[PDB]
Design a protein around this motif. Structure first.
Motif, PDB file in Angstrom:
ATOM      1  N   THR A 271       2.329   9.114 -10.070  1.00  0.00           N
ATOM      2  CA  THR A 271       2.213  10.667 -10.192  1.00  0.00           C
ATOM      3  C   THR A 271       1.410  10.897  -8.620  1.00  0.00           C
ATOM      4  O   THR A 271       1.336  11.959  -8.845  1.00  0.00           O
ATOM      5  CB  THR A 271       1.918  10.874 -11.419  1.00  0.00           C
ATOM      6  OG1 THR A 271       0.404   9.695 -11.569  1.00  0.00           O
ATOM      7  CG2 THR A 271       2.318  10.185 -12.421  1.00  0.00           C
ATOM      8  N   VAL A 272       0.319   9.873  -8.091  1.00  0.00           N
ATOM      9  CA  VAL A 272       0.373  10.582  -7.130  1.00  0.00           C
ATOM     10  C   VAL A 272       0.438   9.570  -5.533  1.00  0.00           C
ATOM     11  O   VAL A 272       0.125  10.569  -4.227  1.00  0.00           O
ATOM     12  CB  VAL A 272      -1.679   9.815  -7.677  1.00  0.00           C
ATOM     13  CG1 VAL A 272      -2.695  10.065  -6.057  1.00  0.00           C
ATOM     14  CG2 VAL A 272      -2.043  10.259  -8.087  1.00  0.00           C
ATOM     15  N   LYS A 273       0.914   8.822  -5.146  1.00  0.00           N
ATOM     16  CA  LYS A 273       1.328   7.656  -4.763  1.00  0.00           C
ATOM     17  C   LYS A 273       2.589   8.616  -3.853  1.00  0.00           C
ATOM     18  O   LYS A 273       2.299   8.604  -2.753  1.00  0.00           O
ATOM     19  CB  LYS A 273       1.458   6.111  -4.841  1.00  0.00           C
ATOM     20  CG  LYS A 273       1.815   5.083  -3.581  1.00  0.00           C
ATOM     21  CD  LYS A 273       2.129   4.254  -3.807  1.00  0.00           C
ATOM     22  CE  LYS A 273       2.520   3.825  -2.681  1.00  0.00           C
ATOM     23  NZ  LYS A 273       3.868   3.825  -1.306  1.00  0.00           N
ATOM     24  N   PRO A 274       3.189   9.227  -4.181  1.00  0.00           N
ATOM     25  CA  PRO A 274       4.380  10.056  -3.320  1.00  0.00           C
ATOM     26  C   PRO A 274       3.413  10.803  -2.655  1.00  0.00           C
ATOM     27  O   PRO A 274       4.279  11.001  -1.756  1.00  0.00           O
ATOM     28  CB  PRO A 274       4.961  10.655  -4.625  1.00  0.00           C
ATOM     29  CG  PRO A 274       5.122   9.364  -6.107  1.00  0.00           C
ATOM     30  CD  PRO A 274       3.400   9.182  -5.734  1.00  0.00           C
ATOM     31  N   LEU A 275       2.523  11.725  -3.009  1.00  0.00           N
ATOM     32  CA  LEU A 275       1.746  12.590  -1.884  1.00  0.00           C
ATOM     33  C   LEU A 275       1.240  11.624  -0.700  1.00  0.00           C
ATOM     34  O   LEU A 275       1.421  12.311   0.386  1.00  0.00           O
ATOM     35  CB  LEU A 275       0.248  13.182  -2.770  1.00  0.00           C
ATOM     36  CG  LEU A 275      -0.158  14.083  -2.503  1.00  0.00           C
ATOM     37  CD1 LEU A 275       0.801  15.130  -0.654  1.00  0.00           C
ATOM     38  CD2 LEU A 275      -1.351  15.381  -2.814  1.00  0.00           C
ATOM     39  N   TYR A 276       0.591  10.561  -0.795  1.00  0.00           N
ATOM     40  CA  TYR A 276       0.114   9.720   0.041  1.00  0.00           C
ATOM     41  C   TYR A 276       1.122   9.337   1.263  1.00  0.00           C
ATOM     42  O   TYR A 276       1.061   9.067   2.087  1.00  0.00           O
ATOM     43  CB  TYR A 276      -0.226   8.983  -0.157  1.00  0.00           C
ATOM     44  CG  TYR A 276      -0.315   7.276   0.789  1.00  0.00           C
ATOM     45  CD1 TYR A 276       0.445   6.377   0.078  1.00  0.00           C
ATOM     46  CD2 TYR A 276      -1.831   7.223   1.044  1.00  0.00           C
ATOM     47  CE1 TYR A 276       0.259   5.541   1.189  1.00  0.00           C
ATOM     48  CE2 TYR A 276      -1.546   6.041   1.623  1.00  0.00           C
ATOM     49  CZ  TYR A 276      -0.689   4.589   2.245  1.00  0.00           C
ATOM     50  OH  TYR A 276      -0.755   3.532   2.944  1.00  0.00           O
ATOM     51  N   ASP A 277       2.962   8.624   0.588  1.00  0.00           N
ATOM     52  CA  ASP A 277       3.785   8.598   1.382  1.00  0.00           C
ATOM     53  C   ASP A 277       4.326   9.459   1.743  1.00  0.00           C
ATOM     54  O   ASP A 277       4.182   9.564   3.082  1.00  0.00           O
ATOM     55  CB  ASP A 277       4.826   8.080   0.534  1.00  0.00           C
ATOM     56  CG  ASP A 277       4.400   7.008  -0.100  1.00  0.00           C
ATOM     57  OD1 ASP A 277       3.849   5.516   0.142  1.00  0.00           O
ATOM     58  OD2 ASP A 277       4.915   5.966  -1.459  1.00  0.00           O
ATOM     59  N   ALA A 278       4.024  11.139   0.801  1.00  0.00           N
ATOM     60  CA  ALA A 278       4.534  11.987   1.825  1.00  0.00           C
ATOM     61  C   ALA A 278       3.792  12.665   3.613  1.00  0.00           C
ATOM     62  O   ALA A 278       3.660  13.176   4.322  1.00  0.00           O
ATOM     63  CB  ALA A 278       4.866  13.735   1.273  1.00  0.00           C
ATOM     64  N   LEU A 279       2.204  12.154   3.034  1.00  0.00           N
ATOM     65  CA  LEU A 279       1.295  12.526   4.216  1.00  0.00           C
ATOM     66  C   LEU A 279       1.605  11.482   5.386  1.00  0.00           C
ATOM     67  O   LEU A 279       1.043  11.575   6.884  1.00  0.00           O
ATOM     68  CB  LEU A 279      -0.040  12.230   3.557  1.00  0.00           C
ATOM     69  CG  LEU A 279      -0.574  13.673   2.626  1.00  0.00           C
ATOM     70  CD1 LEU A 279      -1.910  13.252   2.667  1.00  0.00           C
ATOM     71  CD2 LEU A 279      -0.919  15.020   3.749  1.00  0.00           C
ATOM     72  N   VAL A 280       1.457  10.010   5.040  1.00  0.00           N
ATOM     73  CA  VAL A 280       2.010   8.829   6.078  1.00  0.00           C
ATOM     74  C   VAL A 280       3.609   9.295   7.074  1.00  0.00           C
ATOM     75  O   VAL A 280       3.414   9.491   7.967  1.00  0.00           O
ATOM     76  CB  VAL A 280       2.180   7.565   5.524  1.00  0.00           C
ATOM     77  CG1 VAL A 280       2.554   6.850   6.865  1.00  0.00           C
ATOM     78  CG2 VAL A 280       1.406   7.376   4.507  1.00  0.00           C
ATOM     79  N   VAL A 281       4.351   9.749   5.924  1.00  0.00           N
ATOM     80  CA  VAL A 281       5.286  10.655   7.259  1.00  0.00           C
ATOM     81  C   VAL A 281       5.049  12.457   7.641  1.00  0.00           C
ATOM     82  O   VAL A 281       5.619  12.128   9.045  1.00  0.00           O
ATOM     83  CB  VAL A 281       6.460  10.618   5.579  1.00  0.00           C
ATOM     84  CG1 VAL A 281       8.034  11.860   6.803  1.00  0.00           C
ATOM     85  CG2 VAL A 281       7.436   9.381   5.323  1.00  0.00           C
TER      86      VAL A 281
END
Ligand SMILES: [Cl-]
Ligand SMILES: [Cl-]
Ligand SMILES: [Zn+2]
Ligand SMILES: [Zn+2]
Lengths: 146, 147
Positions: free
Chosen positions: A119-129
């Protein structure tokens, strides 16, 4: 300055897309802002750490983060790209996000690691991308690492 | 540029002090250079990650990384400062260096974790401390990380 500009860009992106991630969209104003700050900063730093790990460059895309999109390519008669399937657009092997998770637990104390991952980590992954996609950030980091 | 300047400063510092740490001082030119580059980059990034962790500011020194050295203070009759005993000059709780260690093994593949901790990690810690000590680095990190 360059770091501040990068983190500002990542926070603006995160603000734009935060509504898509259930763990973030439901948060209160101040907590949401603090969380977006943490995620943007850790995305920047962890992207750098990936890029600085010897041998971390993705072996399928060789660091571009992109691959040919077959169907769209044949539909348009021109090369149409998609995210590299192995690195998902980062161009490098991923760093563990445990430190980012712990930093977020300081703001969301009841956040478990599985709920984080979904629920949260996918936003962090999007930001790394996004670090890899935004030429200014990616190039500044590449030149710094090498 | 700013990141490049920081990493260059840290890499030159590492070369200057490398004689103190046996785990690097015995390395050959190219391998030593690659290892010091990795250590500088991870020190910069992990210092940033410490400063970006809510609640991470050292509670004993309040982020300065410095403390009064009692005995030396009374010896000279004047206040003399010293590295904070809790954070040892970093000003924040420490990130684990596991990713830094793994990155180093790519250049020193037979480096065990204890040998890392005793002979190589101290140089990485010195570089994180130097991030906090060098005003330019510390100030750019603080200003970028804080909102
Ligand atoms: Cl305590
Ligand atoms: Cl501590
Ligand atoms: Zn790839
Ligand atoms: Zn302290």
């Amino acid at each position: 300055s360059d770091k501040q500009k990068a983190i500002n860009y990542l926070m603006q992106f995160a603000h734009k897309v935060s509504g898509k991630y259930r763990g973030v969209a439901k948060l209160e104003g101040n907590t949401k802002a603090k969380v977006l700050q943490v995620l943007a900063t850790f995305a920047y730093a962890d992207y750098c750490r990936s890029a600085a790990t010897p041998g971390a460059r993705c072996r399928d895309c060789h660091g571009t983060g992109r691959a040919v999109d077959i169907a769209k390519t044949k539909l348009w008669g021109r090369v149409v790209e998609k995210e590299c399937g192995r690195c998902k657009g980062v161009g490098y092997s991923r760093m563990p996000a445990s430190a980012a998770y712990r930093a977020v637990t300081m703001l969301i104390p009841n956040l478990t690691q599985p709920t984080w991952s979904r629920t949260v980590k996918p936003l962090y992954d999007a930001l790394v991308v996004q670090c890899h996609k935004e030429e200014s950030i990616a190039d500044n980091i590449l030149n710094a690492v090498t």
